Amino acid sequence: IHHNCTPEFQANEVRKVKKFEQGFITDPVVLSPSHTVGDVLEAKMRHGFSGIPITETGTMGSKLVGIVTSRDIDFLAEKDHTTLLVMTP
Amino acid sequence: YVPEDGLTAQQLFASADGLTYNDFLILPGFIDFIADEVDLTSALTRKITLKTPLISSPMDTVTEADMAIAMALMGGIGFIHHNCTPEFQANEVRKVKKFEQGFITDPVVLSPSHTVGDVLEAKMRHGFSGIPITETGTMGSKLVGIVTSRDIDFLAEKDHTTLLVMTPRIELVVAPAGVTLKEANEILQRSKKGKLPIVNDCDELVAIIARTDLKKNRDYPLASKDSQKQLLCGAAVGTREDDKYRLDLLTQAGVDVIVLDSSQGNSVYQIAMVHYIKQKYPHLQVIGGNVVTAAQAKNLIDAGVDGLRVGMGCGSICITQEVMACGRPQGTAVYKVAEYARRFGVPIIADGGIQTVGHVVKALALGASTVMMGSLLAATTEAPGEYFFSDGVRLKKYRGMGSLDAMEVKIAQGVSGSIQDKGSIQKFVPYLIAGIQHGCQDIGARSLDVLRSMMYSGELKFEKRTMSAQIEGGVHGLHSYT
Amino acid sequence: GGIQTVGHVVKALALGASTVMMGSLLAATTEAPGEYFFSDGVRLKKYRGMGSLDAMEVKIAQGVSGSIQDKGSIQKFVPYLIAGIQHGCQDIGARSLDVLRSMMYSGELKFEKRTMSAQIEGGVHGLHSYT
Amino acid sequence: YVPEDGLTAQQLFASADGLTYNDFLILPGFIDFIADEVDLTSALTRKITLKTPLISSPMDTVTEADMAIAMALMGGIGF
C-alpha cells in the first residue's frame, strides 16, 4: 500500500486487505429498526444495493432483529416514509 | 369597430399558387382557457373515433405490433404494413389485439419431462428463466410447477436431469382467471414472488404476470379500445387477387380497420376491392387509397369507403413527382379534398410531408380529421429494426415502400435512408400532444372540432409567407446555436 | 434541351411536343463517343456543348465542357425510360400520347403550379442520409 | 356533381410567369388499364413515325453510328 495519503487512510486500506474473506461481505451496511424506508432507499441510491440487515443498535455486534430488501420496499407508496419494523422479524 | 385582418381559407386558396404548409401561417385569436383544456377527439372513419389525431404509417420501417400497441395506448392507432407474409401480418395483428397491461403475451412454457438444459437454453435465447411448467408443456392444461434461476442456479454443470428442480403445484401461489391488477398487486405484495400464474378452476394455466412488469405499471386514460376493451389495430392491404386470402386471415385475427394501400386510389382495381370487402365483411371499416382531388374522391365515396387517405408526392422518402410528373402540393390537396368530403360525412387523413408540430396544426386547421406520420415516428424504440451506429450516432433504417430494397424492369418510386434515434413513443407522443394543445390555445380553439368550424365559418384567418418571411420565421443571425 | 428526368419527358409530351431530344441523359453511355476515364475512382465521359471553345477547333463561347458519370448501355437505359413514361401516362389516365395531347387541348387535362416550398416538398427531404 | 379542380394549360400559361418544367405538375385522373397497354407512337416529321418519342442529340459527345443504331433498335432515332 502506498503512503501518498493519510496514516488513518492507509491503515484502513491494510485492515480491508487483512480482514478479507472469500464469499463474505466486508464491512456490511446495517441499520436500526428505528430507521425509515427513506434510509433504505438512500442506501440503495448511494451504494447500489438494498439487502440491508437490521440490528437492535443499528450496527454489528448486537442482537439481530430482521432484514429489509427490495421486495420488502418495492410496493410501498412514494409518500410513505414510515419506520422499519416492512422488516421481516 | 375593428376592421378584419388576414384571409379566410377560401381566399387563401383562390389564387391557385400551389401552397404547402410552409407557405402560410395562422393568425392568433383570443385566449380565455388553458392549453390542457383543449380537446383532441378525432374521427378516423364513419364509425371509429380516437382521442388523439396521430397515426403511424403502414410502412415496414415504422409500424409493427409494438408500435401499434404503443400508439393505441397513447391514444392514436397503427396500421400494420403488408410487405410481409399474410400469416406474419395476421400474427402481428393478433399480438396487438390480445395485449393486456401488466400481463405477459405468449408466455414460454415447458413440460415436466424437459431438462434443465432446456431451461438454460430458454434463458440464453430469450433473456429470462421464470418459466412455468404444465402437464402437456403448453397453455391450456393442468399446471404442475414453475422453475426459475434460484431453482437452476446451484446445480452442477454436468447435470442435465429432467425437471420435476420444479416446485410442485401444491406449493404455488396462483390466482383465478378473473384477476384484476389490484388483486395481483395485493397477492404479489403478500407473497414476495417474482411470478404470478393465473389458472382455471381445474388448474389449467391461462395467464401469468411478472413482478418486474407489474412494478412498471402506468395509467393510460386515452387508450383506443373496442367493445371488448382490446386495443384497436389497423392493417394495410393491396388490390390484387392474393389480397383476398390476406383479408381473410386479418379478419380472423380481429382487425378493426383496413386501409387500401396505393399511390393512386382512383382505379377500377380499388373500386372492385372496396365493393368486395363491403359485400363479404359488411362490419369492416375501409379507408380508400391515396387521392389528391375531389373527382378522385367521388368515385371512392360512391364505392362505399369510410375514410380517405390524402397525399401524393409529399412524403419525405418520395420521388414520385420527379419520376411521374403527378401529384399536388399537400396543403392545397388537404383543403380541397376535406372541403368536398365533409359534405358526405367522410373524414380524411393527411398523409405525408409532416415534419413539425406546426405542420400537424396546419393540417388539422385545413380540415383534416387525422394526421399520419412516417418520418417523425421513425427511429423510435418501438419502430421495427435494430439500431446501428454510423460516426457515433444511433440510427435506424427508414425506407419508402417504393424503394428497390422494399421490392425484393421495376421503377423505383422511393428512397432508403436513416433517422437519428428519438427515444420511446410513450415519451415522444405526449410532447406532440402538448405542442398541438399550445397551438390550439394560441389560435383560440378549445377543440379541433371548434378549430375546423372556425375555419369553415371564416372566423379563422391566415397570412401567406414570402421566402424572406420564411427565413425570418426560423433561426437566423447567430454564430452558433443548439 | 433541359430534360433531366422522366417527369420532364412526360411534361414535355403533355405540353404538346411530339418527340423529345436528350443530350445529357444519353451521355456517358457505352454507345456514346469517347473513351471512358477515371477521376477519383468514378468512370466518366466527356460531355461538351457545340458552342464550347474546344468544339470550335475573336470567337465567343456559348457552351461549356464537362463530364457525366457512366450509365451502362442504351439498350438497358432506354426501356427504363419507356417504363417510366408508361407509368406516368397511366397515373394521368392516358392510354396513348395522342390521347394525352388531345386531353390537354380539350381542357380535360389539369395542372397545378408549384411554389418553391412545394418544389422542396416534392423532393427528398428530412433524412440524415439516403442513397 | 363534382366541381372542377386545377387549371387547363391555357389557364396555366395565361399569367405569363416564365414557367419551366419544375414550376408545375399534372393532376391524376382515372385508371382503367395497365401501364404496358400505353401506346407511345410519335410523329417525327410530316412523314416519319416512330414507336418511341426519344431522340439522341446531334452532338459530338452523344451521337455517332453506334448510338444511332442502338436508338433505332430501341425504337427512337439518332442524328
Ligand SMILES: NC(=O)c1ccc[n+]([C@@H]2O[C@H](COP(=O)([O-])OP(=O)(O)OC[C@H]3O[C@@H](n4cnc5c(N)ncnc54)[C@H](O)[C@@H]3O)[C@@H](O)[C@H]2O)c1
Ligand atoms: N401516395 C404516395 O405518396 C405514394 C407514392 C408512391 C408510392 N407509395 C407507396 O409505395 C407503395 C407502392 O404502391 P404502388 O403505387 O406501386 O401500388 P400498386 O400496387 O397499386 O401499383 C403498382 C401497379 O400495379 C397496378 N395494379 C394494382 N392492382 C392491380 C390489379 N388488380 N390488376 C392489375 N394491375 C394492378 C397499378 O395500377 C399500378 O400500375 C405503397 O406502399 C404505396 O402506398 C405512396
Ligand SMILES: Nc1ncnc2c1ncn2[C@@H]1O[C@H](COP(=O)(O)OP(=O)(O)OP(=O)(O)O)[C@@H](O)[C@H]1O
Ligand atoms: N448489506 C450489504 N452490505 C454490503 N454489501 C452488500 C450488502 N448487500 C449487498 N451488497 C453487495 O451488493 C452486491 C449486489 O447485491 P445482491 O445482488 O446480492 O442483492 P441486493 O443487495 O438485494 O441487490 P438489489 O437491491 O439490486 O436487489 C453483493 O454482491 C454485495 O457485494
Ligand SMILES: Nc1ncnc2c1ncn2[C@@H]1O[C@H](COP(=O)(O)OP(=O)(O)OP(=O)(O)O)[C@@H](O)[C@H]1O
Ligand atoms: N415465462 C415467461 N414468458 C414470457 N416472458 C417472460 C417470462 N418470464 C419472464 N418474462 C419476461 O422477461 C422479463 C424479465 O423477467 P423478470 O425479471 O420478471 O424475471 P425472470 O424471468 O426470473 O428473469 P431472470 O432469469 O433474469 O431472473 C419480464 O418482464 C417478462 O417480460
Ligand SMILES: Nc1ncnc2c1ncn2[C@@H]1O[C@H](COP(=O)(O)OP(=O)(O)OP(=O)(O)O)[C@@H](O)[C@H]1O
Ligand atoms: N408464484 C410463485 N409461487 C411460489 N413460488 C414461486 C412463485 N414464483 C416464483 N417462485 C419461486 O420463488 C423462488 C425464487 O424465484 P423468483 O422467481 O421469485 O426469483 P428469481 O428470478 O429466481 O430470482 P432473482 O430475482 O434473484 O433473479 C423460486 O424457488 C421460484 O420457483
Ligand SMILES: O=c1[nH]cnc2c1ncn2[C@@H]1O[C@H](COP(=O)(O)O)[C@@H](O)[C@H]1O
Ligand atoms: O416509396 C414510396 N414512394 C413515394 N411515397 C411513399 C413511399 N412509401 C410511403 N410513401 C408515402 O409517404 C408517407 C410517409 O410520410 P413521411 O415519411 O412522413 O413524409 C407514407 O405514409 C406514404 O403515403
Ligand SMILES: O=c1[nH]cnc2c1ncn2[C@@H]1O[C@H](COP(=O)(O)O)[C@@H](O)[C@H]1O
Ligand atoms: O454549346 C452549346 N451552347 C448552348 N446550347 C447547346 C450547345 N450545344 C448543344 N446545345 C443545345 O442543348 C441541347 C442539349 O440538351 P441537354 O444537354 O440535355 O440539356 C442540344 O440538343 C442543343 O439544342
